[PDB]
Write a protein that binds this ligand. Structure first.
Ligand SMILES: [Mg+2]
Ligand SMILES: [Mg+2]
Ligand SMILES: [Mg+2]
Ligand SMILES: [Mg+2]
Ligand SMILES: [Mg+2]
Length: 224
C-alpha cells in the first residue's frame, strides 16, 4: 500500500453518531501526506449543532497517514492493508463519565482514502464535561501504544487521551482499539511500537456552521 501513500492523498470522513439518544452526522474533507505524517481536514456537523465537544471526536474522525521511518517501514500495519482497507474499533471510556463505542471502515475508494464511522455513546451524565460542554477547544500530544494480535491477524492499540477542561482539570478518555484487515491477505504484524501524535484545532472564519479545522502530525517510533 506504500506506493499509495507517496505524495498527497485526498480524504473523506463520514461519521454517524448517537450519544445518549442525540443523533448526528459529521462529514470531513481534506488531504493527507504520509511522507511527512501530516493531515489537514475540515469537518462539518451536517445536521446542526454538535451535541458534544468537537475534541472528543478527534481520535474517531486515519492512522494510515502516520509517517513511518524507513527503518520501521515493515511494521506499518496500517498501510500494508490498503487499498482494501481495515476495520477500526474502539472503546473510549471517559473517566467518571460515559463511553463511546466506535466502528469505522478505512480504505480507498478510487483515489480518496475514506473513513466511514458509526459511533454510539452511552451512560453520559447530563451536564458532565462532555454533555455539559466544559472542554477546551484544543488538544494535547499523545502516545499510541501498538502491539500485534496474532489471532485476529491484526493489531491492538491502547492510549489515554487528555482533554483540557474549562476549570483546568483533565478529562481522561481511555482508548482501547482493535484493527483487523478487510481484504484477503497475511498483512504486516508488528512488534511493539508507538505513534507520536500532535494535533491543532482551529476555526474557519467564513464558515457559518459548526465545524472543526484539524491539523495533525503523526510519526511512528519505538523501534531502532
Ligand atoms: Mg455526513
Ligand atoms: Mg528514518
Ligand atoms: Mg458501534
Ligand atoms: Mg452505569
Ligand atoms: Mg501520552
Amino acid at each position: 500500500g506504500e506506493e499509495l501513500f507517496t505524495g498527497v492523498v485526498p480524504i473523506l470522513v463520514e461519521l454517524d453518531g448517537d450519544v445518549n439518544g442525540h443523533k448526528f452526522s459529521v462529514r470531513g474533507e481534506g488531504e493527507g501526506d504520509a511522507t511527512n505524517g501530516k493531515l489537514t481536514l475540515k469537518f462539518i456537523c451536517t445536521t446542526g449543532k454538535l451535541p458534544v465537544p468537537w475534541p472528543t471526536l478527534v481520535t474517531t474522525l486515519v492512522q494510515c497517514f502516520s509517517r513511518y521511518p524507513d527503518h520501521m517501514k515493515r511494521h506499518d500495519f496500517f498501510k500494508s492493508a490498503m487499498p482494501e482497507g481495515y476495520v477500526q474499533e474502539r472503546t473510549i471510556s471517559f473517566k467518571d463519565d460515559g463511553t463511546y463505542k466506535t466502528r469505522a471502515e478505512v480504505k480507498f475508494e478510487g483515489d480518496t482514502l475514506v473513513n466511514r464511522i458509526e459511533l454510539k455513546g452511552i451512560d453520559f451524565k447530563e451536564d458532565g464535561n462532555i454533555l455539559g460542554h466544559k472542554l477546551e477547544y484544543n488538544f494535547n500530544s499523545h502516545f499510541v501504544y501498538i502491539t500485534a494480535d496474532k489471532q485476529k491477524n491484526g493489531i491492538k492499540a491502547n492510549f489515554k487521551i487528555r482533554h483540557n477542561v474549562e476549570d483546568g482539570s483533565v478529562q481522561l478518555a481511555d482508548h482501547y482499539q482493535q484493527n483487523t484487515p478487510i481484504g484477503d491477505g497475511p498483512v504486516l504484524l508488528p512488534d511493539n511500537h508507538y505513534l507520536s501524535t500532535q494535533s491543532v484545532l482551529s476555526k474557519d472564519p467564513n464558515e457559518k456552521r459548526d465545524h472543526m479545522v484539524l491539523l495533525e502530525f503523526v510519526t511512528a517510533a519505538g523501534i531502532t
